[PDB]
Amino acid sequence: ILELEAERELLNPPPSPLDKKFEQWEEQQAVEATLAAMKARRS
Amino acid sequence: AALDRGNEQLAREALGQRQSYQSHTEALGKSLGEQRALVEQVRGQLQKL
């Protein structure tokens, strides 16, 4: 099982941890800005 | 957009990341510049034959 799991990973490389950190930061920024607008719009 | 935070280190990381892609783009752009000039001559030879 592990051989196949790694072999299919070689053909299509997994994304770099830097990319994951960047997208996590983007999601956090988006949700924070959206909730800030959420709090400001009803006020 | 990432520079907005004010942490320039991640900006440096991204800028150093894109350089490999720029080099690859230039490498392919060099090869196309001659393949395009050669296929035309081959087509001309076929047309005359």
mmCIF file of N, CA, C and O in Angstrom:
data_model
loop_
_atom_site.group_PDB
_atom_site.id
_atom_site.type_symbol
_atom_site.label_atom_id
_atom_site.label_comp_id
_atom_site.label_asym_id
_atom_site.label_seq_id
_atom_site.Cartn_x
_atom_site.Cartn_y
_atom_site.Cartn_z
ATOM 1 N N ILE A 1 0.832 -1.199 0.000
ATOM 2 C CA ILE A 1 0.000 0.000 0.000
ATOM 3 C C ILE A 1 0.869 1.252 0.000
ATOM 4 O O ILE A 1 0.614 2.205 -0.750
ATOM 5 N N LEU A 2 1.905 1.273 0.844
ATOM 6 C CA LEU A 2 2.766 2.452 0.912
ATOM 7 C C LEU A 2 3.494 2.696 -0.403
ATOM 8 O O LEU A 2 3.695 3.853 -0.796
ATOM 9 N N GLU A 3 3.890 1.628 -1.095
ATOM 10 C CA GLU A 3 4.566 1.785 -2.376
ATOM 11 C C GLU A 3 3.676 2.504 -3.381
ATOM 12 O O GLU A 3 4.115 3.439 -4.055
ATOM 13 N N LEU A 4 2.410 2.089 -3.487
ATOM 14 C CA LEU A 4 1.496 2.755 -4.411
ATOM 15 C C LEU A 4 1.215 4.185 -3.978
ATOM 16 O O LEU A 4 1.131 5.090 -4.819
ATOM 17 N N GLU A 5 1.069 4.411 -2.670
ATOM 18 C CA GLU A 5 0.793 5.760 -2.191
ATOM 19 C C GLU A 5 1.927 6.713 -2.548
ATOM 20 O O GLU A 5 1.683 7.861 -2.934
ATOM 21 N N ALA A 6 3.173 6.257 -2.424
ATOM 22 C CA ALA A 6 4.299 7.104 -2.805
ATOM 23 C C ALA A 6 4.463 7.206 -4.317
ATOM 24 O O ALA A 6 4.860 8.263 -4.824
ATOM 25 N N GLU A 7 4.177 6.128 -5.048
ATOM 26 C CA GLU A 7 4.356 6.141 -6.493
ATOM 27 C C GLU A 7 3.396 7.117 -7.156
ATOM 28 O O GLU A 7 3.776 7.851 -8.074
ATOM 29 N N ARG A 8 2.137 7.139 -6.708
ATOM 30 C CA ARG A 8 1.203 8.118 -7.255
ATOM 31 C C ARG A 8 1.522 9.530 -6.789
ATOM 32 O O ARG A 8 1.107 10.493 -7.440
ATOM 33 N N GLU A 9 2.239 9.675 -5.673
ATOM 34 C CA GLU A 9 2.650 11.000 -5.228
ATOM 35 C C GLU A 9 3.794 11.531 -6.080
ATOM 36 O O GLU A 9 3.907 12.743 -6.299
ATOM 37 N N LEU A 10 4.663 10.637 -6.552
ATOM 38 C CA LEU A 10 5.769 11.063 -7.407
ATOM 39 C C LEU A 10 5.268 11.673 -8.712
ATOM 40 O O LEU A 10 5.806 12.683 -9.178
ATOM 41 N N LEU A 11 4.247 11.066 -9.323
ATOM 42 C CA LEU A 11 3.755 11.558 -10.608
ATOM 43 C C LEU A 11 3.175 12.961 -10.483
ATOM 44 O O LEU A 11 3.430 13.823 -11.330
ATOM 45 N N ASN A 12 2.390 13.207 -9.437
ATOM 46 C CA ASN A 12 1.781 14.511 -9.185
ATOM 47 C C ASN A 12 2.304 15.015 -7.849
ATOM 48 O O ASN A 12 1.807 14.621 -6.787
ATOM 49 N N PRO A 13 3.308 15.886 -7.866
ATOM 50 C CA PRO A 13 3.928 16.340 -6.617
ATOM 51 C C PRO A 13 2.917 17.016 -5.710
ATOM 52 O O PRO A 13 2.044 17.758 -6.181
ATOM 53 N N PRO A 14 3.003 16.780 -4.407
ATOM 54 C CA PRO A 14 2.130 17.474 -3.465
ATOM 55 C C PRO A 14 2.555 18.923 -3.320
ATOM 56 O O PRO A 14 3.714 19.264 -3.600
ATOM 57 N N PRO A 15 1.660 19.805 -2.889
ATOM 58 C CA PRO A 15 2.029 21.217 -2.761
ATOM 59 C C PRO A 15 3.006 21.448 -1.620
ATOM 60 O O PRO A 15 3.023 20.727 -0.620
ATOM 61 N N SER A 16 3.831 22.478 -1.793
ATOM 62 C CA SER A 16 4.845 22.806 -0.808
ATOM 63 C C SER A 16 4.198 23.306 0.483
ATOM 64 O O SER A 16 3.107 23.882 0.457
ATOM 65 N N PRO A 17 4.845 23.084 1.631
ATOM 66 C CA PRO A 17 4.308 23.637 2.886
ATOM 67 C C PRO A 17 4.202 25.149 2.874
ATOM 68 O O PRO A 17 3.334 25.707 3.555
ATOM 69 N N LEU A 18 5.068 25.831 2.119
ATOM 70 C CA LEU A 18 4.950 27.278 1.979
ATOM 71 C C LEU A 18 3.621 27.658 1.341
ATOM 72 O O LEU A 18 2.970 28.621 1.765
ATOM 73 N N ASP A 19 3.204 26.912 0.316
ATOM 74 C CA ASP A 19 1.922 27.181 -0.327
ATOM 75 C C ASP A 19 0.782 26.980 0.667
ATOM 76 O O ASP A 19 -0.154 27.788 0.722
ATOM 77 N N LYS A 20 0.851 25.915 1.471
ATOM 78 C CA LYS A 20 -0.181 25.684 2.475
ATOM 79 C C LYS A 20 -0.231 26.810 3.500
ATOM 80 O O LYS A 20 -1.323 27.262 3.867
ATOM 81 N N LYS A 21 0.927 27.276 3.965
ATOM 82 C CA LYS A 21 0.947 28.395 4.903
ATOM 83 C C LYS A 21 0.339 29.642 4.274
ATOM 84 O O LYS A 21 -0.442 30.357 4.913
ATOM 85 N N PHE A 22 0.681 29.910 3.012
ATOM 86 C CA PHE A 22 0.157 31.091 2.336
ATOM 87 C C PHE A 22 -1.359 31.026 2.198
ATOM 88 O O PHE A 22 -2.059 32.015 2.445
ATOM 89 N N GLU A 23 -1.889 29.865 1.807
ATOM 90 C CA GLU A 23 -3.333 29.767 1.618
ATOM 91 C C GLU A 23 -4.067 29.807 2.954
ATOM 92 O O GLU A 23 -5.164 30.371 3.051
ATOM 93 N N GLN A 24 -3.471 29.230 4.001
ATOM 94 C CA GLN A 24 -4.065 29.341 5.329
ATOM 95 C C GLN A 24 -4.120 30.796 5.776
ATOM 96 O O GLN A 24 -5.136 31.251 6.321
ATOM 97 N N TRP A 25 -3.040 31.544 5.540
ATOM 98 C CA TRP A 25 -3.035 32.959 5.894
ATOM 99 C C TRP A 25 -4.080 33.729 5.097
ATOM 100 O O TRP A 25 -4.753 34.614 5.640
ATOM 101 N N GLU A 26 -4.219 33.420 3.805
ATOM 102 C CA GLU A 26 -5.235 34.085 2.994
ATOM 103 C C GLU A 26 -6.633 33.809 3.529
ATOM 104 O O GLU A 26 -7.466 34.720 3.608
ATOM 105 N N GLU A 27 -6.911 32.556 3.893
ATOM 106 C CA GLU A 27 -8.222 32.225 4.437
ATOM 107 C C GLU A 27 -8.479 32.972 5.738
ATOM 108 O O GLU A 27 -9.584 33.483 5.964
ATOM 109 N N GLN A 28 -7.469 33.039 6.612
ATOM 110 C CA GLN A 28 -7.641 33.758 7.870
ATOM 111 C C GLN A 28 -7.900 35.240 7.631
ATOM 112 O O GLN A 28 -8.777 35.835 8.267
ATOM 113 N N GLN A 29 -7.153 35.853 6.710
ATOM 114 C CA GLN A 29 -7.386 37.258 6.393
ATOM 115 C C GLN A 29 -8.792 37.470 5.853
ATOM 116 O O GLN A 29 -9.478 38.425 6.240
ATOM 117 N N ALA A 30 -9.237 36.586 4.960
ATOM 118 C CA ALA A 30 -10.566 36.725 4.377
ATOM 119 C C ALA A 30 -11.646 36.635 5.445
ATOM 120 O O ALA A 30 -12.557 37.471 5.488
ATOM 121 N N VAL A 31 -11.553 35.639 6.329
ATOM 122 C CA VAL A 31 -12.603 35.465 7.329
ATOM 123 C C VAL A 31 -12.578 36.613 8.332
ATOM 124 O O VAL A 31 -13.632 37.097 8.764
ATOM 125 N N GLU A 32 -11.384 37.091 8.698
ATOM 126 C CA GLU A 32 -11.302 38.207 9.635
ATOM 127 C C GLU A 32 -11.897 39.476 9.039
ATOM 128 O O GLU A 32 -12.674 40.176 9.701
ATOM 129 N N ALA A 33 -11.555 39.786 7.787
ATOM 130 C CA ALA A 33 -12.114 40.973 7.149
ATOM 131 C C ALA A 33 -13.623 40.852 6.993
ATOM 132 O O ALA A 33 -14.359 41.826 7.195
ATOM 133 N N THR A 34 -14.106 39.659 6.636
ATOM 134 C CA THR A 34 -15.537 39.486 6.433
ATOM 135 C C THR A 34 -16.297 39.632 7.747
ATOM 136 O O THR A 34 -17.363 40.251 7.789
ATOM 137 N N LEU A 35 -15.752 39.093 8.843
ATOM 138 C CA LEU A 35 -16.428 39.258 10.127
ATOM 139 C C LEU A 35 -16.340 40.696 10.627
ATOM 140 O O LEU A 35 -17.257 41.168 11.308
ATOM 141 N N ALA A 36 -15.256 41.407 10.306
ATOM 142 C CA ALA A 36 -15.191 42.825 10.645
ATOM 143 C C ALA A 36 -16.271 43.611 9.913
ATOM 144 O O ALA A 36 -16.958 44.451 10.511
ATOM 145 N N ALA A 37 -16.443 43.345 8.616
ATOM 146 C CA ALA A 37 -17.527 43.981 7.873
ATOM 147 C C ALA A 37 -18.884 43.560 8.421
ATOM 148 O O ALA A 37 -19.835 44.349 8.424
ATOM 149 N N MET A 38 -18.985 42.315 8.888
ATOM 150 C CA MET A 38 -20.213 41.819 9.496
ATOM 151 C C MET A 38 -20.576 42.628 10.733
ATOM 152 O O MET A 38 -21.726 43.048 10.905
ATOM 153 N N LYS A 39 -19.600 42.850 11.612
ATOM 154 C CA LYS A 39 -19.819 43.662 12.802
ATOM 155 C C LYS A 39 -20.093 45.122 12.474
ATOM 156 O O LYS A 39 -20.895 45.754 13.170
ATOM 157 N N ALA A 40 -19.457 45.669 11.439
ATOM 158 C CA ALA A 40 -19.638 47.072 11.096
ATOM 159 C C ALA A 40 -20.944 47.362 10.370
ATOM 160 O O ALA A 40 -21.469 48.474 10.500
ATOM 161 N N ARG A 41 -21.487 46.401 9.620
ATOM 162 C CA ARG A 41 -22.654 46.684 8.790
ATOM 163 C C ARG A 41 -23.924 46.815 9.626
ATOM 164 O O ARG A 41 -24.778 47.662 9.335
ATOM 165 N N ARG A 42 -24.073 45.991 10.665
ATOM 166 C CA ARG A 42 -25.265 46.090 11.501
ATOM 167 C C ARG A 42 -25.196 47.294 12.428
ATOM 168 O O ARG A 42 -26.229 47.743 12.938
ATOM 169 N N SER A 43 -24.001 47.828 12.657
ATOM 170 C CA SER A 43 -23.829 48.991 13.515
ATOM 171 C C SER A 43 -24.115 50.279 12.751
ATOM 172 O O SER A 43 -24.260 51.349 13.342
ATOM 173 N N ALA B 1 -0.261 41.143 -2.880
ATOM 174 C CA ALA B 1 -1.230 41.219 -1.798
ATOM 175 C C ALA B 1 -0.653 40.780 -0.463
ATOM 176 O O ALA B 1 -1.120 41.245 0.583
ATOM 177 N N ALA B 2 0.353 39.904 -0.473
ATOM 178 C CA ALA B 2 0.898 39.389 0.775
ATOM 179 C C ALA B 2 1.742 40.434 1.491
ATOM 180 O O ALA B 2 1.887 40.386 2.717
ATOM 181 N N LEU B 3 2.316 41.380 0.747
ATOM 182 C CA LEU B 3 3.122 42.400 1.411
ATOM 183 C C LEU B 3 2.292 43.289 2.330
ATOM 184 O O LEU B 3 2.870 44.025 3.136
ATOM 185 N N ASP B 4 0.961 43.238 2.218
ATOM 186 C CA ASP B 4 0.080 44.127 2.971
ATOM 187 C C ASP B 4 0.329 44.018 4.471
ATOM 188 O O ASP B 4 0.361 45.046 5.155
ATOM 189 N N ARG B 5 0.545 42.805 4.985
ATOM 190 C CA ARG B 5 0.843 42.606 6.399
ATOM 191 C C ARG B 5 2.011 43.456 6.880
ATOM 192 O O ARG B 5 1.978 43.940 8.017
ATOM 193 N N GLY B 6 3.018 43.674 6.039
ATOM 194 C CA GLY B 6 4.200 44.401 6.445
ATOM 195 C C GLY B 6 5.388 43.532 6.778
ATOM 196 O O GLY B 6 6.416 44.058 7.218
ATOM 197 N N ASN B 7 5.282 42.223 6.579
ATOM 198 C CA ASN B 7 6.374 41.284 6.814
ATOM 199 C C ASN B 7 7.005 41.074 5.443
ATOM 200 O O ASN B 7 6.437 40.396 4.583
ATOM 201 N N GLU B 8 8.181 41.670 5.240
ATOM 202 C CA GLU B 8 8.841 41.582 3.945
ATOM 203 C C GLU B 8 9.530 40.243 3.728
ATOM 204 O O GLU B 8 9.913 39.939 2.595
ATOM 205 N N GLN B 9 9.708 39.443 4.784
ATOM 206 C CA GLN B 9 10.405 38.169 4.630
ATOM 207 C C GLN B 9 9.630 37.218 3.727
ATOM 208 O O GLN B 9 10.214 36.554 2.861
ATOM 209 N N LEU B 10 8.311 37.141 3.909
ATOM 210 C CA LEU B 10 7.500 36.302 3.033
ATOM 211 C C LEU B 10 7.496 36.837 1.605
ATOM 212 O O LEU B 10 7.439 36.061 0.642
ATOM 213 N N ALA B 11 7.556 38.162 1.447
ATOM 214 C CA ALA B 11 7.681 38.735 0.113
ATOM 215 C C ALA B 11 8.984 38.304 -0.544
ATOM 216 O O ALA B 11 9.009 37.964 -1.733
ATOM 217 N N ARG B 12 10.078 38.303 0.222
ATOM 218 C CA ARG B 12 11.349 37.810 -0.296
ATOM 219 C C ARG B 12 11.252 36.339 -0.675
ATOM 220 O O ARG B 12 11.798 35.916 -1.700
ATOM 221 N N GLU B 13 10.565 35.542 0.148
ATOM 222 C CA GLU B 13 10.396 34.126 -0.167
ATOM 223 C C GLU B 13 9.649 33.934 -1.482
ATOM 224 O O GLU B 13 10.072 33.146 -2.337
ATOM 225 N N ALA B 14 8.541 34.653 -1.668
ATOM 226 C CA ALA B 14 7.769 34.519 -2.900
ATOM 227 C C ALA B 14 8.569 34.997 -4.108
ATOM 228 O O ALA B 14 8.524 34.386 -5.187
ATOM 229 N N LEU B 15 9.300 36.101 -3.948
ATOM 230 C CA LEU B 15 10.092 36.626 -5.053
ATOM 231 C C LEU B 15 11.206 35.664 -5.441
ATOM 232 O O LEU B 15 11.480 35.471 -6.630
ATOM 233 N N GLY B 16 11.859 35.049 -4.456
ATOM 234 C CA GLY B 16 12.829 34.019 -4.764
ATOM 235 C C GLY B 16 12.228 32.758 -5.341
ATOM 236 O O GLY B 16 12.914 32.049 -6.084
ATOM 237 N N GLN B 17 10.970 32.465 -5.018
ATOM 238 C CA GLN B 17 10.274 31.331 -5.614
ATOM 239 C C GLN B 17 9.971 31.545 -7.090
ATOM 240 O O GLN B 17 10.141 30.623 -7.895
ATOM 241 N N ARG B 18 9.529 32.745 -7.469
ATOM 242 C CA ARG B 18 9.113 32.963 -8.853
ATOM 243 C C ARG B 18 10.274 32.973 -9.842
ATOM 244 O O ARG B 18 10.037 32.919 -11.057
ATOM 245 N N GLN B 19 11.516 33.052 -9.360
ATOM 246 C CA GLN B 19 12.645 33.205 -10.273
ATOM 247 C C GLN B 19 12.882 31.944 -11.093
ATOM 248 O O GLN B 19 13.278 32.024 -12.262
ATOM 249 N N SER B 20 12.650 30.771 -10.504
ATOM 250 C CA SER B 20 12.783 29.537 -11.271
ATOM 251 C C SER B 20 11.780 29.496 -12.418
ATOM 252 O O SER B 20 12.118 29.092 -13.539
ATOM 253 N N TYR B 21 10.542 29.917 -12.157
ATOM 254 C CA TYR B 21 9.538 29.955 -13.213
ATOM 255 C C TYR B 21 9.899 30.975 -14.285
ATOM 256 O O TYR B 21 9.689 30.725 -15.478
ATOM 257 N N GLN B 22 10.441 32.127 -13.888
ATOM 258 C CA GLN B 22 10.904 33.086 -14.888
ATOM 259 C C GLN B 22 12.010 32.495 -15.755
ATOM 260 O O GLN B 22 12.015 32.675 -16.982
ATOM 261 N N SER B 23 12.956 31.784 -15.138
ATOM 262 C CA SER B 23 14.035 31.169 -15.903
ATOM 263 C C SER B 23 13.495 30.132 -16.882
ATOM 264 O O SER B 23 13.936 30.068 -18.035
ATOM 265 N N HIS B 24 12.540 29.313 -16.438
ATOM 266 C CA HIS B 24 11.929 28.332 -17.333
ATOM 267 C C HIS B 24 11.209 29.008 -18.495
ATOM 268 O O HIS B 24 11.296 28.553 -19.645
ATOM 269 N N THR B 25 10.478 30.087 -18.208
ATOM 270 C CA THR B 25 9.781 30.807 -19.265
ATOM 271 C C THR B 25 10.762 31.339 -20.300
ATOM 272 O O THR B 25 10.537 31.201 -21.508
ATOM 273 N N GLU B 26 11.870 31.925 -19.844
ATOM 274 C CA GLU B 26 12.879 32.403 -20.784
ATOM 275 C C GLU B 26 13.500 31.260 -21.578
ATOM 276 O O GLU B 26 13.763 31.409 -22.780
ATOM 277 N N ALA B 27 13.738 30.118 -20.931
ATOM 278 C CA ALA B 27 14.340 28.983 -21.624
ATOM 279 C C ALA B 27 13.451 28.496 -22.759
ATOM 280 O O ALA B 27 13.935 28.201 -23.858
ATOM 281 N N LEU B 28 12.143 28.398 -22.515
ATOM 282 C CA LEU B 28 11.249 27.983 -23.596
ATOM 283 C C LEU B 28 11.082 29.064 -24.658
ATOM 284 O O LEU B 28 10.960 28.745 -25.853
ATOM 285 N N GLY B 29 11.062 30.335 -24.248
ATOM 286 C CA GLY B 29 10.963 31.412 -25.215
ATOM 287 C C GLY B 29 12.147 31.468 -26.155
ATOM 288 O O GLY B 29 12.010 31.886 -27.307
ATOM 289 N N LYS B 30 13.326 31.067 -25.678
ATOM 290 C CA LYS B 30 14.481 31.005 -26.568
ATOM 291 C C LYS B 30 14.305 29.930 -27.638
ATOM 292 O O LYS B 30 14.611 30.163 -28.812
ATOM 293 N N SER B 31 13.812 28.750 -27.251
ATOM 294 C CA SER B 31 13.694 27.641 -28.197
ATOM 295 C C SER B 31 12.617 27.906 -29.243
ATOM 296 O O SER B 31 12.783 27.563 -30.428
ATOM 297 N N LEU B 32 11.497 28.500 -28.824
ATOM 298 C CA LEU B 32 10.449 28.805 -29.792
ATOM 299 C C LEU B 32 10.942 29.770 -30.863
ATOM 300 O O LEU B 32 10.551 29.650 -32.033
ATOM 301 N N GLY B 33 11.824 30.700 -30.490
ATOM 302 C CA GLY B 33 12.298 31.697 -31.434
ATOM 303 C C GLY B 33 13.029 31.114 -32.627
ATOM 304 O O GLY B 33 13.123 31.759 -33.674
ATOM 305 N N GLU B 34 13.567 29.902 -32.492
ATOM 306 C CA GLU B 34 14.212 29.235 -33.617
ATOM 307 C C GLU B 34 13.338 28.165 -34.257
ATOM 308 O O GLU B 34 13.386 27.982 -35.484
ATOM 309 N N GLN B 35 12.523 27.456 -33.470
ATOM 310 C CA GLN B 35 11.640 26.471 -34.091
ATOM 311 C C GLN B 35 10.652 27.142 -35.038
ATOM 312 O O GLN B 35 10.341 26.606 -36.114
ATOM 313 N N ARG B 36 10.150 28.321 -34.657
ATOM 314 C CA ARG B 36 9.235 29.045 -35.531
ATOM 315 C C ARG B 36 9.915 29.448 -36.833
ATOM 316 O O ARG B 36 9.298 29.403 -37.903
ATOM 317 N N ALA B 37 11.185 29.846 -36.764
ATOM 318 C CA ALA B 37 11.907 30.221 -37.972
ATOM 319 C C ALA B 37 12.272 29.027 -38.841
ATOM 320 O O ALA B 37 12.526 29.211 -40.035
ATOM 321 N N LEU B 38 12.318 27.820 -38.281
ATOM 322 C CA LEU B 38 12.692 26.656 -39.082
ATOM 323 C C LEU B 38 11.493 25.985 -39.761
ATOM 324 O O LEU B 38 11.597 25.513 -40.910
ATOM 325 N N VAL B 39 10.350 25.928 -39.068
ATOM 326 C CA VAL B 39 9.190 25.256 -39.654
ATOM 327 C C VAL B 39 8.740 25.964 -40.928
ATOM 328 O O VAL B 39 8.248 25.325 -41.867
ATOM 329 N N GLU B 40 8.902 27.287 -40.986
ATOM 330 C CA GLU B 40 8.499 28.030 -42.176
ATOM 331 C C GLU B 40 9.305 27.602 -43.398
ATOM 332 O O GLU B 40 8.751 27.412 -44.490
ATOM 333 N N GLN B 41 10.619 27.444 -43.234
ATOM 334 C CA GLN B 41 11.452 27.006 -44.348
ATOM 335 C C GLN B 41 11.095 25.586 -44.774
ATOM 336 O O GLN B 41 11.068 25.277 -45.976
ATOM 337 N N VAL B 42 10.805 24.710 -43.808
ATOM 338 C CA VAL B 42 10.389 23.355 -44.185
ATOM 339 C C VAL B 42 9.098 23.399 -45.000
ATOM 340 O O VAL B 42 8.946 22.685 -46.006
ATOM 341 N N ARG B 43 8.149 24.243 -44.583
ATOM 342 C CA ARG B 43 6.900 24.383 -45.325
ATOM 343 C C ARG B 43 7.150 24.879 -46.744
ATOM 344 O O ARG B 43 6.521 24.401 -47.697
ATOM 345 N N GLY B 44 8.055 25.844 -46.902
ATOM 346 C CA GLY B 44 8.378 26.320 -48.239
ATOM 347 C C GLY B 44 8.945 25.227 -49.127
ATOM 348 O O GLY B 44 8.594 25.122 -50.312
ATOM 349 N N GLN B 45 9.828 24.395 -48.570
ATOM 350 C CA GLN B 45 10.379 23.292 -49.352
ATOM 351 C C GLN B 45 9.279 22.341 -49.807
ATOM 352 O O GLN B 45 9.260 21.899 -50.967
ATOM 353 N N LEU B 46 8.348 22.016 -48.906
ATOM 354 C CA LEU B 46 7.239 21.148 -49.297
ATOM 355 C C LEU B 46 6.415 21.781 -50.412
ATOM 356 O O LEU B 46 6.032 21.110 -51.383
ATOM 357 N N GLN B 47 6.136 23.081 -50.292
ATOM 358 C CA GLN B 47 5.334 23.752 -51.306
ATOM 359 C C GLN B 47 5.990 23.709 -52.676
ATOM 360 O O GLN B 47 5.294 23.509 -53.676
ATOM 361 N N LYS B 48 7.308 23.886 -52.751
ATOM 362 C CA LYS B 48 7.962 23.816 -54.058
ATOM 363 C C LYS B 48 8.001 22.395 -54.625
ATOM 364 O O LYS B 48 7.777 22.194 -55.835
ATOM 365 N N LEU B 49 8.279 21.401 -53.775
ATOM 366 C CA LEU B 49 8.270 20.018 -54.244
ATOM 367 C C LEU B 49 6.910 19.639 -54.814
ATOM 368 O O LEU B 49 6.823 18.859 -55.775
#
